[PDB]
Design an enzyme around this catalytic site. Structure first.
Site, PDB file in Angstrom:
ATOM      1  N   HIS A 281       7.178  -7.210  -2.584  1.00 45.90           N
ATOM      2  CA  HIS A 281       6.971  -6.590  -1.064  1.00 45.90           C
ATOM      3  C   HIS A 281       7.618  -7.217  -0.197  1.00 45.90           C
ATOM      4  O   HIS A 281       8.054  -7.089   0.859  1.00 45.90           O
ATOM      5  CB  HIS A 281       5.598  -6.915  -0.596  1.00 45.90           C
ATOM      6  CG  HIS A 281       4.309  -6.009  -1.495  1.00 45.90           C
ATOM      7  ND1 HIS A 281       4.739  -4.758  -1.786  1.00 45.90           N
ATOM      8  CD2 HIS A 281       3.325  -6.595  -2.186  1.00 45.90           C
ATOM      9  CE1 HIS A 281       3.582  -4.313  -2.378  1.00 45.90           C
ATOM     10  NE2 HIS A 281       2.629  -5.629  -2.777  1.00 45.90           N
TER      11      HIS A 281
ATOM     12  N   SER B 256      -4.812   2.503   4.914  1.00 44.01           N
ATOM     13  CA  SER B 256      -5.079   2.083   3.496  1.00 44.01           C
ATOM     14  C   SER B 256      -4.953   0.350   3.616  1.00 44.01           C
ATOM     15  O   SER B 256      -5.687  -0.373   3.010  1.00 44.01           O
ATOM     16  CB  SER B 256      -3.983   2.376   2.569  1.00 44.01           C
ATOM     17  OG  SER B 256      -4.038   2.009   1.067  1.00 44.01           O
TER      18      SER B 256
ATOM     19  N   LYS C 186       0.691  -1.232  -0.135  1.00 48.76           N
ATOM     20  CA  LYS C 186      -0.078   0.036   0.103  1.00 48.76           C
ATOM     21  C   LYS C 186       0.717   1.389  -0.064  1.00 48.76           C
ATOM     22  O   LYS C 186       0.264   2.397   0.385  1.00 48.76           O
ATOM     23  CB  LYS C 186      -1.086   0.111   1.423  1.00 48.76           C
ATOM     24  CG  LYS C 186      -1.570  -1.374   1.336  1.00 48.76           C
ATOM     25  CD  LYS C 186      -2.389  -2.139   0.296  1.00 48.76           C
ATOM     26  CE  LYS C 186      -3.310  -1.231  -0.346  1.00 48.76           C
ATOM     27  NZ  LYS C 186      -3.643  -1.722  -1.612  1.00 48.76           N
TER      28      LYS C 186
HETATM   29  N1  LIG Z   1      -2.209   7.291  -9.583  1.00 49.94           N
HETATM   30  C1  LIG Z   1      -2.199   7.028  -8.271  1.00 49.94           C
HETATM   31  N2  LIG Z   1      -2.034   8.210  -7.584  1.00 49.94           N
HETATM   32  C2  LIG Z   1      -2.091   8.390  -6.327  1.00 49.94           C
HETATM   33  N3  LIG Z   1      -2.488   7.214  -5.410  1.00 49.94           N
HETATM   34  C3  LIG Z   1      -2.410   6.155  -6.095  1.00 49.94           C
HETATM   35  C4  LIG Z   1      -2.317   6.020  -7.587  1.00 49.94           C
HETATM   36  N4  LIG Z   1      -2.656   4.412  -8.055  1.00 49.94           N
HETATM   37  C5  LIG Z   1      -2.994   4.090  -6.799  1.00 49.94           C
HETATM   38  N5  LIG Z   1      -2.692   4.845  -5.719  1.00 49.94           N
HETATM   39  C6  LIG Z   1      -2.944   4.459  -4.307  1.00 49.94           C
HETATM   40  O1  LIG Z   1      -1.963   3.623  -3.754  1.00 49.94           O
HETATM   41  C7  LIG Z   1      -2.381   2.744  -2.649  1.00 49.94           C
HETATM   42  C8  LIG Z   1      -2.239   1.130  -3.170  1.00 49.94           C
HETATM   43  O2  LIG Z   1      -0.848   1.029  -3.266  1.00 49.94           O
HETATM   44  P1  LIG Z   1      -0.423  -0.266  -3.887  1.00 49.94           P
HETATM   45  O3  LIG Z   1      -0.659  -0.324  -5.364  1.00 49.94           O
HETATM   46  O4  LIG Z   1       0.960  -0.392  -3.329  1.00 49.94           O
HETATM   47  O5  LIG Z   1      -1.306  -1.390  -3.125  1.00 49.94           O
HETATM   48  C9  LIG Z   1      -3.989   3.132  -2.750  1.00 49.94           C
HETATM   49  O6  LIG Z   1      -3.865   3.993  -1.580  1.00 49.94           O
HETATM   50  P2  LIG Z   1      -5.114   4.572  -0.762  1.00 49.94           P
HETATM   51  O7  LIG Z   1      -6.109   3.011  -0.422  1.00 49.94           O
HETATM   52  O8  LIG Z   1      -4.822   5.192   0.441  1.00 49.94           O
HETATM   53  O9  LIG Z   1      -5.825   5.298  -1.568  1.00 49.94           O
HETATM   54  C10 LIG Z   1      -4.257   3.625  -3.926  1.00 49.94           C
HETATM   55  O10 LIG Z   1      -5.752   4.522  -3.944  1.00 49.94           O
HETATM   56  N1  LIG Z   2      -3.313 -12.032  -2.262  1.00 49.99           N
HETATM   57  C1  LIG Z   2      -3.765 -11.272  -3.612  1.00 49.99           C
HETATM   58  C2  LIG Z   2      -2.403 -10.635  -4.222  1.00 49.99           C
HETATM   59  C3  LIG Z   2      -1.724  -9.371  -3.209  1.00 49.99           C
HETATM   60  C4  LIG Z   2      -1.499  -9.729  -1.773  1.00 49.99           C
HETATM   61  C5  LIG Z   2      -1.108  -8.709  -0.908  1.00 49.99           C
HETATM   62  C6  LIG Z   2      -0.398  -7.485  -1.476  1.00 49.99           C
HETATM   63  O1  LIG Z   2       0.251  -6.725  -0.732  1.00 49.99           O
HETATM   64  C7  LIG Z   2      -0.410  -7.073  -2.890  1.00 49.99           C
HETATM   65  O2  LIG Z   2       0.181  -5.992  -3.438  1.00 49.99           O
HETATM   66  C8  LIG Z   2      -1.031  -8.193  -3.962  1.00 49.99           C
END
Ligand SMILES: Nc1ncnc2c1ncn2[C@@H]1O[C@H](COP(=O)(O)O)[C@@H](OP(=O)(O)O)[C@H]1O
Ligand SMILES: NCCc1ccc(O)c(O)c1
Length: 287
Positions: A100, A130, A40
């Site tokens: 990750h 998040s 996240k």
């Molecule tokens: N283009 C963008 N600009 C800003 N935040 C973005 C984005 N694309 C994805 N995110 C945010 O990045 C987070 C997910 O990150 P990851 O891909 O590492 O899981 C989420 O945060 P939030 O749930 O706080 O909004 C998501 O909404």
């Molecule tokens: N298990 C569904 C795939 C998955 C699980 C954990 C994460 O942090 C991620 O970016 C994607």
């Protein structure tokens, strides 16, 4: 909702823990590009920016398939989907890899081969919030319970992939001896163009000013939210249930202020002060 499994001190989702077996045979290529982050922290966002740079800024090429198909997720071992290692066998160099994994569990081949790494970190408060919702909608993670409950586990590092404090610190440290572009989610929010430019420079590529601005617009939260090739709406509702909580939730820095209670915020600041004591790392809780 299966429980976590512990491996070398790291809590992981069962499917990931398992994938570690085959992963010991993974062979890194010198021209591979690794994208590592604690969950996240902006993985999907930087993955889109990078795939666009590799595709010369062509949107129709970035549309070729979902991001998790363009940028294989190394450890992924989900039910009814190609393992990450598998998807990588057929990915055309130069490859973009997502992960990750903490240094303790990362395949040595990646370090030996001196693979370039783009790391992204985000302030812990927003990550926690998040991550809580992600636990809700992502049916592969264990039951998150109440927010208060979750936050407690988050501080103890008792969540998939483990401690956020240790993850950001180790990588920050490793960036001395290994080629690692260390980015900040907040900086990316603040001035996209300024950050993508650091990336272009890192991978040693260049783009026409006008193509640059084009990416900036298509890597925007608004845009990536509608795009089905980056918003994860293409995976079964048994893996991800967007009605519970969208993958693309808010895309805001500072949104934690509407979830943390004053009590929680006090407890968290004290704890963080102890854990980040001797570190040169510095996070901005808002803009
Ligand atoms: N283009 C963008 N600009 C800003 N935040 C973005 C984005 N694309 C994805 N995110 C945010 O990045 C987070 C997910 O990150 P990851 O891909 O590492 O899981 C989420 O945060 P939030 O749930 O706080 O909004 C998501 O909404
Ligand atoms: N298990 C569904 C795939 C998955 C699980 C954990 C994460 O942090 C991620 O970016 C994607």
């Amino acid at each position: 909702r299966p429980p976590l499994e512990y491996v070398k001190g790291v809590p992981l989702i069962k499917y990931f823990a398992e994938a570690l077996g085959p992963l010991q045979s993974f062979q890194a290529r010198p021209d591979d590009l690794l994208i590592n982050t604690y969950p996240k922290s902006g993985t999907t966002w930087v993955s889109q920016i990078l795939d666009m740079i590799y595709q010369g800024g062509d949107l129709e090429k970035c549309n070729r398939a979902p991001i998790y198909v363009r940028v294989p997720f190394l450890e992924v071992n989900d039910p009814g989907e190609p393992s990450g290692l598998e998807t990588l066998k057929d990915t055309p160099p130069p490859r973009l890899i997502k992960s990750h994994l903490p240094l303790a569990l990362l395949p040595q081949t990646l370090l030996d081969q001196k693979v370039k790494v783009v790391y992204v970190a985000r302030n812990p408060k927003d990550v926690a919030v998040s991550y809580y919702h992600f636990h809700r909608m992502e049916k592969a993670h264990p039951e998150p319970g109440t927010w208060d409950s979750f936050l407690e586990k988050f501080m103890a590092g008792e969540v998939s992939y483990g401690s956020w404090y240790q993850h950001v610190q180790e990588w920050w440290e490793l960036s001395r001896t290994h080629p690692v572009l260390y980015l900040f989610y907040e900086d990316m929010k603040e001035n996209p163009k300024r950050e993508i430019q650091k990336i272009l420079e890192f991978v040693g590529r260049s783009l026409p000013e006008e193509t640059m601005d084009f990416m900036v617009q298509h890597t925007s939260f608004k845009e990536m939210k509608k795009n089905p090739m980056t918003n994860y709406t293409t995976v079964p509702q048994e893996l991800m249930d967007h009605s519970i909580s969208p993958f693309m939730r808010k895309g805001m820095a500072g949104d934690w202020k509407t979830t943390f209670t004053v009590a929680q915020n006090e407890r968290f600041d004290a704890d963080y002060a102890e854990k980040m004591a001797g570190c040169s790392l510095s996070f901005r809780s808002e803009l």
